[PDB]
Amino acid sequence: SLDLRARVREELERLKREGLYISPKVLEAPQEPVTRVEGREVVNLASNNYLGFANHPYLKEKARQYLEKWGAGSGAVRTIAGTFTYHVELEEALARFKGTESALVLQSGFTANQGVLGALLKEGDVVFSDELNHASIIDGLRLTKATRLVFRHADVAHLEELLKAHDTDGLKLIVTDGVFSMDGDIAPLDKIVPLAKKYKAVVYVDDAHGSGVLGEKGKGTVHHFGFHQDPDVVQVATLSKAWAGIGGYAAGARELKDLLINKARPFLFSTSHPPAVVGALLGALELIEKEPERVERLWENTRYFKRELARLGYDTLGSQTPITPVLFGEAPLAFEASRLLLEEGVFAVGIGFPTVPRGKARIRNIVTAAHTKEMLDKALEAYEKVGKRLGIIR
Amino acid sequence: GAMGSLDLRARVREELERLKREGLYISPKVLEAPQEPVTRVEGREVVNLASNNYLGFANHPYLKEKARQYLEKWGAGSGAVRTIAGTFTYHVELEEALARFKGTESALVLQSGFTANQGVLGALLKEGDVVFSDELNHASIIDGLRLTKATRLVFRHADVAHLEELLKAHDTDGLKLIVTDGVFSMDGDIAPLDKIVPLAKKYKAVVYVDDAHGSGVLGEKGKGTVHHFGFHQDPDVVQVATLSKAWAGIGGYAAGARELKDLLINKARPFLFSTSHPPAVVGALLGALELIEKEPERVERLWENTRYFKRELARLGYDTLGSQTPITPVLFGEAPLAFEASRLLLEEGVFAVGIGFPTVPRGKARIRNIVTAAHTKEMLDKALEAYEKVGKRLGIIR
Ligand SMILES: *Cc1c(COP(=O)(O)O)cnc(C)c1O
Ligand SMILES: *Cc1c(COP(=O)(O)O)cnc(C)c1O
């Protein structure tokens, strides 16, 4: 039998041979549109901080008030002694904001997917999953006894063919990202939801990258498509991206929240979030109502950055959200491009196969409300210099 | 079916009516004051023995101030996963402080104890590996294992005779992993690592310890069960534990050999696909580690309180199920009597929650009490007075 170091080496030297081994960088200043990496100031386009909330004094003061009042830790799972007044306050504020009958907060978007898919799905159920769904959705589904089918990315012709072919006396669940993390495209819920109604299916939307981004005042992708009051639409999304904390929520029908409280394994077995995290998120919800112009500025910045990259000759892959991939083609060129950007004071991560297709390696950039014109123009200047040098633009 | 596939409210009702029939429907209490040995439930001050707050850290000013400093310096959110733009100086500060405290070469912090088990078991295990799992392992270990392609065997609880029988019968060219709670979450007994680890060496196996209830509780200064048994430098012993219980925050850690940390950074799915913890959480936990070094007598007081409380429950005629740690179950037998006993304790000013099947065996329903360093003699005696009154009234003690 192998020992631990022997198994570690076999896995690590595999990744190193594969060109898959990661050496993460340590950020040396707060999560902001300008930050410090390897001792140098950089324009940061790598983070999920869409509304510039992650170091906003308003969230930090509401966090500080809840910290001082309630303490450092909840000290139990929600179902034993870890539900406090402040957890209830945040679920009421979220449901109000989402426009859904109910909201439940869980330990992360990652565990929310396990909890909600696990609670909802039984043996004999059929799941129809978009090809390009977030990894956390796959782990949720693997823990269920449901039949798992995959439809080609955003392909409602294929989805329909599968719904047609796979009837059940149980539940049909159509499972999609709201906004896909890599290409920044929006799930076609305008076609998926009606298809759901034809073949009696429930729609499950993991809106990590749509929450605080799409819809009126950032109420999300489901709100954007107008389906937030539909009891047969279930929404899950992280509180770690636009909302700039940690946690994930489940929102929809009244009855869903009671089922999750009683069945969701991460809710039953993992400690509830502490006062400072809940304080910050109550802050984030109050701040986005006080400053709806933040969402405006996120989209203005996004449109400016995509338009200027198109002018230089770059392909941003039809991205529809602040997720702005810049195509470099092959993995090595994307990684070299990222290295050269950092030399220019711009921090944005190269992504290639297996995370994205062969021939579709990109640098992933996420535009935020807190980026200034000078910051975006510095990124553009760097992309111009690096693009010319690597012969992807002229 | 004539009417089609089920709608969401139909599946919810069907599941909730089932749970209500099975006696599995839960209406959690809402706590109206901080996590302390005395808190407020339903408008009334109560002796709280329901929480995991072993060292009384959850509302300690020292953790709150170190959390405050990190919050002010760094902000409300990390805003990315560790592998992209979510590792900050403070995450590495906490990992270095944890490895130093644990006496392991390395430590890595993950989103929870629950997901830590998925990340570490998932990173380590491949198709053709053999896992030997204790019968009474935590739900989070089961979910970690289910996500792996490893062959899964179960040994009768703490039964090193049966474990050896299985090791003898189930060989692999890959990895043998013996997986156990360090401290069992429900019956509060200690994994026999003094016997498991030597057995692991005989059959060339790695030992995996989920020490959620041992971290900050067993060993010198609460360094944990693996430290208590003296195996903290062993590269073939892996530890995972929550930072949510004794350490009174959120998160989980993985500790052991240098190489383990680099494999988790590259392979652990919760690490790759979930946002890192924010400054307030990391601040509080750096604070917790400084406070237990300033006040290691907290562990002594936790154990004095534990021994007192166990002895007095035995005196009344209650069965605490051979519990060894501050986890002090009181056996009621059936789930309904545990639930009723919990209701009657609340009437007496005492908050402790009943637990029955499926989380514990049928006929082994109990109230879980967790004694802490911050419980006073008067609080424990008030709990005992309540257990006496409720016990006599339900005809379980005489
Ligand atoms: C509490 C506990 C966990 C879960 O830890 P969280 O950080 O609350 O997710 C895992 N394993 C065991 C043994 C536990 O007791
Ligand atoms: C980021 C993300 C998650 C994970 O959310 P965490 O709160 O970071 O665990 C899940 N699903 C999708 C689609 C995401 O983009």
Residue numbers in the entry:
A (entry chain B): 3 to 396
B (entry chain A): -1 to 396
Can you list sentences taken from the study reporting this PDB entry?
We report a chemo-biocatalytic cascade for the synthesis of substituted pyrroles, driven by the action of an irreversible, thermostable, pyridoxal 5′-phosphate (PLP)-dependent, C–C bond-forming biocatalyst (ThAOS). The ThAOS catalyzes the Claisen-like condensation between various amino acids and acyl-CoA substrates to generate a range of α-aminoketones. Like other members of the AOS family, ThAOS forms a tight homodimer with the PLP cofactor bound at the interface between the two monomers, typical of type IV PLP-binding enzymes. We next characterized ThAOS thermostability, finding it stable at temperatures of up to 80 °C over 3 h.
The successful application of ThAOS for pyrrole synthesis inspired us to understand the molecular basis for the broad substrate specificity displayed by this enzyme. The final key result was the determination of the 1.6 Å resolution crystal structure of ThAOS with the bound PLP cofactor. This molecular insight paves the way for future engineering of ThAOS to expand its substrate range—an endeavor which will be aided by the inherent and unique thermostability of ThAOS. We predict that Arg366 is involved in similar functions in ThAOS, allowing the biocatalyst to accept the observed broad range of AAs. The acceptance of acyl-CoA substrates ranging from C2–C8 is more difficult to understand since there is a lack of high-resolution structures of bacterial AOS:acyl-CoA complexes. However, the observation that ThAOS can use various acyl-CoAs suggests that the binding site is suitably dynamic to accommodate a broad range of acyl chains. Furthermore, a sequence alignment of ThAOS with 7 other AOS members highlights conserved residues that are potentially involved in substrate binding and catalysis. These will be ideal candidates for future engineering.
